[PDB]
């Protein structure tokens, strides 16, 4: 229980390793993304470069990099008073996991 | 003699000596308080944490400061 | 893994530049395998205000660690 979870990753066995990965994906912080993929509800991902994407997850991974479709990139570029709202639609998209900040699940 | 930084943080924890933690720049804040516990990765929990910009900041309570931002821990 | 070769800088005054702007001078006391360093009697060189009796520096933000002594 507590010992295996706190146990350093270089001494557990192979079977307990993928069991730990499955447990992390089922009961954990990524359970949110797993549920969002399973019931097919859109997610609003806020990237590091001030880009918000609205999409439906089709596969995620440990590093939180996901494949998305029906992506709709929304971002604003500004300087001083002037602001312009630009949007872009992408059919199928791969997304690296080092950029994401907060992943919001649609209510 | 040689004292490792882990032992130094342990001494801070044991003697409850107040520390002023320098979060690195482009954040522009400092944390002052007492260390209650530390981790492997320089993660520290702080009691009576005081927020100070770079002195009119607001107390935060008990916080867990992630170690990827800490730069100095001075008393 | 491999401890950095700082066994000759022990108890000798060194000046190391924190991040890209700050520069801190003190007496080295110990080090770790991450190049964390604990240095006593620090002084933030800029007038220059002392830091404290015992400070630790995370080895991520150290760039250079030149020594101001005989070595």
């Amino acid at each position: 229980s507590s010992q295996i979870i706190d146990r350093p990753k270089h001494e557990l066995s192979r079977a307990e390793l993928e069991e730990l990965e499955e447990f992390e994906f089922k009961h954990g912080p990524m359970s949110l993304i797993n549920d969002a993929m399973v019931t097919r509800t859109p997610v609003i991902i806020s990237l590091r470069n001030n880009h918000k994407i609205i999409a439906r997850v089709k596969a995620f991974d440990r590093h939180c990099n996901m494949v998305l479709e029906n992506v709709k990139e929304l971002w604003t570029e500004k300087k001083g008073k002037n602001v312009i709202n630009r949007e872009r639609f992408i059919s199928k998209l791969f997304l690296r996991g080092d950029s994401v900040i907060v992943v919001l699940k649609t209510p | 003699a040689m004292v490792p930084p882990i032992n130094c943080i342990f001494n801070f924890l044991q003697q409850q000596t107040p520390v002023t933690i320098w979060l690195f720049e482009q954040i522009g804040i400092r944390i002052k308080g007492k260390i209650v516990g530390f981790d492997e990765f320089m993660n520290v929990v702080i009691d009576e944490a005081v927020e100070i910009p770079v002195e009119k900041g607001t107390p935060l309570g008990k916080i867990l400061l992630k170690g990827d931002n800490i730069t100095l821990i001075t008393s | 893994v491999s401890t950095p070769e700082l066994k000759k800088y022990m108890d000798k005054k060194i000046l190391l530049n924190i991040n890209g702007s700050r520069k801190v001078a003190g007496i080295l006391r110990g080090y770790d395998i991450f190049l964390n360093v604990v240095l006593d009697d620090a002084m933030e060189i800029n007038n220059n205000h002392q830091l404290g009796l015992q400070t630790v520096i995370r080895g991520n933000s150290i760039i250079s660690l030149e020594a101001l002594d005989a070595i």
Binding site: P8 | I6, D39, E40 | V1, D32, I33
Partner: peptide, 16 residues
């Protein structure tokens, strides 16, 4: 023994 984190564990755990 992998990344220095394991070695630091085998120091901090004894320290506590």
């Amino acid at each position: 023994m992998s990344t220095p984190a394991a070695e630091q564990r085998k120091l901090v755990e004894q320290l506590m």
